[PDB]
Structure formats: C-alpha cells, structure tokens
Design a protein around this ligand. Sequence first.
Ligand code: NAI
Lengths: 226, 254
Amino acid sequence: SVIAITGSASGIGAALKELLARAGHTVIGIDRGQADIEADLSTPGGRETAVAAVLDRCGGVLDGLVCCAGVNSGLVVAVNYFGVSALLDGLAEALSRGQQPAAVIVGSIAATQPGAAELPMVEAMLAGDEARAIELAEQQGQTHLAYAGSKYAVTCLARRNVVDWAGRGVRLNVVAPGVAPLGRGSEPREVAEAIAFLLGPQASFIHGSVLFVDGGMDALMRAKTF
Amino acid sequence: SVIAITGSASGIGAALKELLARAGHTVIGIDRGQADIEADLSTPGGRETAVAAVLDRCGGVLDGLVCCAGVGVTAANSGLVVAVNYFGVSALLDGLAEALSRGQQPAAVIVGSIAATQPGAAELPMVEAMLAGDEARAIELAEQQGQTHLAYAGSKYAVTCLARRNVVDWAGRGVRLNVVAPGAVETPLLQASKADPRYGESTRRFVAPLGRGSEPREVAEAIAFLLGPQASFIHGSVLFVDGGMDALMRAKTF
Ligand SMILES: NC(=O)C1=CN([C@@H]2O[C@H](COP(=O)(O)OP(=O)(O)OC[C@H]3O[C@@H](n4cnc5c(N)ncnc54)[C@H](O)[C@@H]3O)[C@@H](O)[C@H]2O)C=CC1
C-alpha cells in the first residue's frame, strides 16, 4: 500500500513511517522539514501545496492517509484542525481510487477535557470557518484550551463524516493516545501499531471508531462514558 | 499462546477459534455443546464447571480469554439474557484472573454490543444489580422490566462498564482487558432477530454506513488484535466494530 503520513518527521508519525516501511508498505512523508514533501499545514497555501504534491507523487491514487501533524492559540487551531481537514478533504478522491483505502486521524485524550465541547472555538471549527475559529481561540488566549478544543473538534469531524466516507468506500477512524493504570506512558511505536491496524485489512469493518491507546486512563477516569 | 474462548461453537467465537488456530495458537473452546468444554454459562454451576475445566486444560496458565458466549432478543426470557451476557462473562473473568496473571503478555476481551449505547440503558435498575454482582436481584429486575431487548441492552451496558470499572485490578495483575462492541454481524443470532415477529422490523430498520453487516471473521480480527502484543498499551478500551453505526447515531460521544 501507498500511505501518506503528515508529521512523518518525528514522534508517532516517524514511528509509523518506520513501522510501515519495515512491513513492506510505501510511505509518502509530509512534514515541516525532513520529509518527502515539506509543507506548512498552518496556512491554506501550505495545505494546498502539500495536497498537490501528494497527488503528484501518488498519481492521484492513494491507499492510506494518516494525519499526525500537530503543534499561540491561532496556530494550534490552524494546524490541529484545519491542517487535518484540508488534507482529508483534498485527498478524499485519491483515497476513493485506492485499494481497500482507509485513513486515520491522531486525536488525543485531551479531546475528552471537560468543557471542551462547549468552547465557542469548537462550533467555528466544525462550521469550517477558520478565520472566526482563529479569532475566538486568540481571544480565549490559552494555547492548552485551543489544543483541547481542536482535538475535540477534529474527533467530532471524523465521526460526523462517517456517511460521506462510507460513500467513497474509504474507512476513517481516530486513535486517541494518552499515571495510567498500566503504570507507564506509551512508546510512539505502540500508537503506530494501533494506527497500522486501523489502516489495514484486519480492520475492514471498523469505521468512525475512536480507539483509545492510553493504558487504561480513559476507563479509569470516565468509566461510564463510552 | 493458549487462549480460551467462550461461545466457540458458532458465529464470532467460531470464527475466532478458527483464526487463532490457523495462526498457531492453542484454543480452548467453551460452549453449550460442540466444544472442548461443554458447559451452561447461565448458571453458577455451569460457570464453575467451565472455569475448573479451563484451568485443567491450560495447567492453570492462560495467555488469552475471550468472553463471546451470549444470547440475543430471542432468548427464553430476560433472566436468561442477564445470566449469560453478564454473569457468564463476569464469573469466567473472576475465576480465570489468576491463570491469566500467570500467562505471557496476557490479555482478555469481552464481546459487548452497540446495544450497550441504547438510550436509557444506563438507568435500567437491572444494571445496578449486575454491577453489584447480585445475580438473583438482577434476574428478578430483568424479568420485571419485561422485554428481552432491555435485558440485552442492560446486560451489554453493564458488562462493558464492568470491564472499565475494573481497569486498575486487571492492570495490577498484568493483564489487559478490553471490549469489542459489534454492530450487526451475519450470524445465527442476527438471523434469529431478523426473523422474529416482535424484533424483526427493529432489527432490519437501519443499516450501518458501510452498507452491510459484518462477517464474523471481521469481528474476530479485531478481537485477535486486542489479544496480541501489537495492542500492548490498549487497556479498558471499547472498540466499536460496527461499520460506522455508532459514529452515525452518536457522533459527539467518545
Ligand atoms: N451477531 C450480532 O449481530 C451481534 C452479536 N453480538 C454479541 O456477540 C457474541 C457472539 O454472538 P454471535 O456469534 O453473533 O452469536 P451465535 O449464537 O452464533 O454464537 C454465540 C455462541 O454462544 C454460545 N452460548 C450462548 N449461551 C450460552 C451458554 N448459556 N453457555 C455456553 N455457551 C452459550 C452459543 O451456544 C453460541 O455457540 C454474543 O455475546 C452477542 O451478544 C453483539 C452485537 C451484535
């Protein structure tokens, strides 16, 4: 499979890149630097450039997409929400043309922060109004609030488009990485393994799911919420 | 590794038994019949038999346990639904916890249901009795509630909560425990619901976004993943395997 990965140059994206390469897949890496495709996903121009470059590289046909790129509050909203949505939307056609195509967004357990759902930022993001979402985040003035709000919104975005993606024949799921009950934090490779699972043919009936990979933390803190 | 599977004689459990066996694992099947271990998981006595028999077969060391035995809305009565879907799971987890703790990279999976997310399921009285472990009370409440679908949703809700509530105890034993929550899957259980006078329309009313039901093997693959070392940091999670149904019906819940 030919799989595009944003944030391929560090952390989870880099671990996934390595994992998939070792497993025999072809990886198109997209990141700010040290990548096949170097682009700034915080701007519409960077997103446009990255989408065109991916399409060129894969000949308009793509088997997988993983959005891992993430990071003032305006920048947080621009990268973590709109840098994901522009890439998903820009590459949806190419994915629809691929072989058992699937995509994964790397969310965060911060998406479950109490009150995130009610942040004005969030409505603007889900409406697709970037200028208004950035303005709202900047007047809120807390980067960590923008982080939680963007992760909440991007997780909602995945689920809300479950019908559109099904219609294209492309699965779309979220991985929500996380002391946890398991007594440690995760290695980037462990998150990468969950992503690779969701991308692959073993997950052929999994669509619109949010898979927590957090050593039990969400179960401990939100037992009743599922 | 050595993995016990309740409900191995049919549907999802049968698919998983085949999948694991082909991958080289030793599978210990438990079912009403047509299994290594024949036991009725709807009574304390049957569960006791099953646990003792599993321990004997694995030498008191287990690397995997999958609680897949269950009944749906065409079961005999609401009491039976609770006895099997909740207590047939919990008693096997209780009884085999020590054996699992002794295994290598051990892990367990409960097969839940998207029915767990039915509105109002959380507030069904029978749910409290299940989580308290009071089987006689849960069965009485289930019977009084009057409808197998409520016992089905209640039992699936409760057993999912159980997995999450006990997250720390399982971590302390070094054993991961997760739930798989299927939407419709093209076994004999689904066919029975589809043809039922009372619940058929309900069952056939809406299809998942993927436009089809799951094949049992697709659910088995998700279970096998959660059992294995590539899921080493996944614990207390509920993995929906439903072709988009839950995302469609509860888009903002996670
Ligand atoms: N088929 C579906 O659409 C869905 C199924 N599920 C769950 O998946 C699990 C497996 O169901 P399926 O494979 O579809 O059904 P199935 O009927 O094909 O298999 C269930 C197996 O459990 C065994 N079992 C039932 N009661 C038992 C008892 N008292 N003692 C020992 N074994 C017993 C049965 O004999 C059967 O072999 C069940 O927990 C069910 O609730 C969840 C969502 C959807």
